[PDB]
């Protein structure tokens, strides 16, 4: 039950406010769902995004112009947008809820002295016209931003749930490449096991088949299916209660071959390494292994002509490997705080020392990159490529191999490969 | 006949429009903004891009931010083409209607635009970067208004690329109203819909209308209900597709079993759709068949017993609105509700109601999408008013379950016959 957990994690929100408020001499916060988006010249409206600082608080994320008022000792004010043209849940209990019919009528909702109460939100045309002045105050986002790091039970529970829902989907787009369907079809299935429509998933899946796999940011979806089926490589999560899944997987059509051999040994590498997650343990020094698992793997596969170590002394690893080992995840897919060392806020996504309760990615990659091999061709780094074999995996793209992980104090919970996604 | 042989004649319409705005405005020339991505806040995921539809008035280019098209109407149009070059991430026949320059980042723009900005006219949504680049004339509204009325006379290009639009919808509508007789759910038959059009969510030109039972009343439904009804009895659709910038508008209504009296309304109130579509003609005011949808609606409650009144007197009491709240349809093309509709000049001023008022012509395009709902708030106003006694309010409990009728089409109106796209693809 969530419910029991709500409590906890409500408890913890207030505890948190009450500091930064004291500390930063407010009155209270407030934070703004945010509003529809309306599309130039146009009626239309752009799908709506919750504030990330507002969902934080409860599982409201599909209704723009609501409010939360807090100072973490009497009950959170919620102003709930509901309007009543013609075209209850567990939370409900823990706020003092108002009920706006429309938007402009939040005014005599609001605090009438609003001088010391800071707004957190996107709008802050509408906050000045409301009376606000201190907007989005720094000390105060990277007071929470900070604490953000740190998942209470009930968010890790939100978070295992996302999870789950994304492993299904996974699987199902796993399946329906083995049939030979098309990036479009793969991604209908994943919307169909998920039960997500496209603006559900909490960023673009990345659903590429062969070539397309060494595309990073690819984002379109063939809707014609390729000559011959070579290998695949998604990208995908879903969201629970605001709360996101990112999962990579790559898979190699027949399960033979040097590129499935490639496929293996980046997963033996991207598991040791999940493994390496510890309290105590500056995030940067996986990254370096991860260079270093990289190196002995274009070694190994002669792919490159020298030994592990001189691969990553000569810089040659970024050419395969360009981007960070991972991330924090939690409300945003590229969570907060993932840079700070401290409530103050004093490539790699994440360096921040790891802790107890704090949720990561590990996603290391080896990819054929047009561009990048371009480039390293010109260097003196020329003699030392094994461009025969790189011109063979070309046509497959890329790997990524991605799990999102639980610390915990004396274990960790993957909670991507304990649900059993190969 | 080919998209590539109307396409010349397209824009060499684009440019004569062009011509004359420049010339009656005073304007060196004219520029358009295809626009930008918008971020999330405090984050780095972005919104989907939506493009200007000024711009893409010009060619079929909707996915792509930071481009820039600088018309005079004697010159070649210059196309300013976005193209980035990293590790992350035109040649088809309108290209060589451009002069086209790549930008390889937005900030390099400055260079490839007019040195000298003042006569010209920015046409987009982004006020502020374009002050900066030095543009001072913010989509001015004599050459808005002249835009958007002709706008309402497509070319035959885009009458060609809306008969496709059509025809991909038509398939998505195909597979729904299948999905829906095998008892799905609103998620699954949406899922039906988007595989048979090929289309993503955030590619269909509006948010799909997928309501089964009750839902069929809420005319601003946008859900998708995962777990399909324990019983079947109604099904609406309004659903669309784009192609090259141009969409589709498509309402269709169902009834599951296809017998009693909730089917024989369906069957009532498409014959009078049918009728409304037919009286489309150049000359008439869109008002006219506006009217006539009320008394055809009027007649249908009178002769289904619903209002117990002669059709006339259910129009003279004003009851017809509780039953058809809406317009009966809009110009429709590059926008949904397409620009141009309530325009009675190029100086934009309006033809004053009895959404769409302006008067039909030859090479306009409409939809008509009369409906018959049974809409709770607006029954709960009807038993308070003095026109209680007039109905029957027994079988508006036994039609509520139902939720409510639209059916609607895409036709296109030429000077001799009307071209209705949706029944001709064989959607009954
Ligand atoms: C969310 C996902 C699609 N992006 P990523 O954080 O897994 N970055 C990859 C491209 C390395
Ligand atoms: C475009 C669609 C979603 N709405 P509509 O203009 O076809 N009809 C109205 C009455 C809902
Ligand atoms: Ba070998
Ligand atoms: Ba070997
Ligand atoms: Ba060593
Ligand atoms: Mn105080
Ligand atoms: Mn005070
Ligand atoms: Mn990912
Ligand atoms: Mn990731
Ligand atoms: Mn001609
Ligand atoms: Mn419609
Ligand atoms: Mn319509």
């Given at each position: 039950k969530?419910?029991?957990?709500y409590?906890?994690?409500?408890?913890?929100?207030?505890?948190?406010?009450?500091?930064?408020?004291?500390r930063?001499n407010?009155?209270?916060?407030?934070?703004?769902?945010?509003?529809a988006?309306?599309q130039?010249l146009?009626?239309?409206?752009?799908?709506?995004?919750?504030n990330?600082?507002?969902?934080a608080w409860?599982?409201?994320?599909?209704?723009?112009?609501?409010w939360?008022?807090?100072?973490?000792?009497?009950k959170?004010?919620?102003?709930?947008y509901?309007?009543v043209?013609?075209?209850?849940?567990?939370?409900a209990?823990?706020?003092?809820?108002?009920?706006?019919?429309?938007?402009?009528?939040?005014?005599?909702?609001?605090?009438?002295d609003?001088?010391?109460?800071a707004?957190?939100?996107?709008?802050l045309?509408?906050?000045?016209?409301?009376?606000?002045?201190?907007?989005?105050?720094?000390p105060?986002?990277?007071?929470?931003?900070?604490?953000?790091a740190?998942?209470?039970?009930?968010?890790l529970?939100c978070?295992?749930?996302?999870?789950?829902?994304?492993?299904?989907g996974?699987?199902?787009?796993?399946?329906?490449?083995?049939?030979?369907?098309?990036?479009?079809?793969?991604?209908?299935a994943?919307?169909?096991?998920?039960?997500?429509?496209?603006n559900?998933?909490?960023?673009?899946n990345?659903?590429?088949?062969?070539?397309?796999?060494?595309?990073?940011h690819?984002?379109?979806?063939?809707?014609?299916?390729?000559?011959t089926?070579?290998s695949?490589?998604?990208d995908?999560?879903?969201?629970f209660?605001?709360?996101?899944?990112?999962?990579?997987?790559?898979?190699?059509?027949?399960?033979?071959?040097?590129?499935?051999?490639?496929?293996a040994?980046?997963?033996?590498?991207?598991?040791?390494?999940?493994?390496?997650?510890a309290?105590?343990?500056?995030?940067?020094?996986?990254?370096?292994?991860?260079?270093?698992?990289?190196?002995?793997?274009?070694?190994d596969?002669?792919?490159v002509?020298?030994?592990?170590?001189?691969?990553?002394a000569?810089?040659?690893?970024?050419?395969?490997?360009?981007?960070?080992?991972?991330?924090?995840?939690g409300?945003?897919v590229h969570?907060?705080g993932?840079?700070?060392?401290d409530?103050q806020?004093?490539?790699?996504?994440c360096?921040?020392?790891?802790?107890?309760?704090?949720?990561?990615?590990?996603?290391?990659?080896?990819?054929?990159?047009?561009?990048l091999?371009?480039?390293?061709?010109?260097?003196?780094?020329?003699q030392?490529?094994?461009?025969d074999?790189?011109?063979?995996?070309?046509?497959?793209?890329?790997?990524?191999?991605?799990?999102?992980?639980?610390?915990?104090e004396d274990?960790?919970?993957?909670?991507?490969?304990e649900?059993?996604?190969?």
């Amino acid at each position: 039950k969530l419910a029991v957990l709500y409590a906890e994690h409500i408890a913890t929100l207030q505890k948190r406010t009450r500091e930064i408020i004291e500390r930063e001499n407010l009155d209270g916060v407030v934070f703004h769902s945010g509003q529809a988006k309306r599309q130039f010249l146009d009626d239309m409206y752009y799908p709506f995004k919750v504030n990330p600082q507002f969902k934080a608080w409860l599982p409201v994320i599909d209704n723009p112009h609501c409010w939360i008022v807090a100072n973490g000792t009497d009950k959170p004010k919620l102003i709930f947008y509901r309007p009543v043209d013609f075209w209850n849940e567990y939370w409900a209990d823990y706020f003092d809820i108002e009920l706006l019919v429309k938007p402009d009528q939040v005014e005599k909702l609001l605090p009438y002295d609003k001088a010391r109460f800071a707004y957190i939100g996107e709008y802050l045309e509408v906050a000045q016209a409301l009376g606000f002045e201190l907007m989005n105050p720094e000390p105060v986002m990277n007071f929470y931003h900070y604490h953000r790091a740190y998942k209470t039970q009930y968010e890790l529970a939100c978070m295992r749930e996302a999870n789950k829902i994304a492993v299904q989907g996974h699987k199902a787009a796993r399946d329906a490449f083995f049939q030979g369907k098309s990036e479009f079809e793969i991604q209908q299935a994943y919307l169909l096991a998920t039960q997500h429509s496209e603006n559900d998933t909490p960023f673009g899946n990345i659903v590429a088949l062969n070539e397309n796999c060494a595309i990073l940011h690819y984002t379109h979806f063939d809707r014609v299916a390729p000559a011959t089926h070579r290998s695949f490589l998604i990208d995908a999560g879903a969201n629970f209660n605001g709360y996101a899944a990112d999962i990579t997987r790559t898979y190699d059509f027949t399960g033979e071959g040097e590129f499935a051999e490639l496929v293996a040994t980046m997963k033996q590498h991207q598991i040791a390494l999940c493994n390496q997650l510890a309290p105590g343990k500056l995030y940067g020094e996986l990254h370096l292994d991860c260079h270093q698992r990289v190196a002995q793997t274009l070694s190994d596969f002669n792919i490159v002509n020298l030994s592990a170590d001189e691969i990553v002394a000569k810089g040659i690893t970024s050419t395969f490997f360009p981007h960070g080992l991972g991330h924090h995840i939690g409300l945003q897919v590229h969570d907060v705080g993932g840079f700070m060392a401290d409530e103050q806020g004093a490539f790699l996504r994440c360096t921040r020392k790891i802790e107890a309760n704090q949720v990561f990615t590990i996603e290391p990659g080896l990819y054929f990159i047009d561009s990048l091999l371009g480039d390293l061709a010109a260097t003196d780094n020329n003699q030392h490529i094994n461009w025969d074999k790189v011109a063979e995996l070309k046509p497959f793209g890329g790997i990524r191999i991605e799990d999102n992980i639980i610390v915990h104090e004396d274990s960790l919970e993957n909670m991507t490969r304990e649900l059993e996604l190969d």
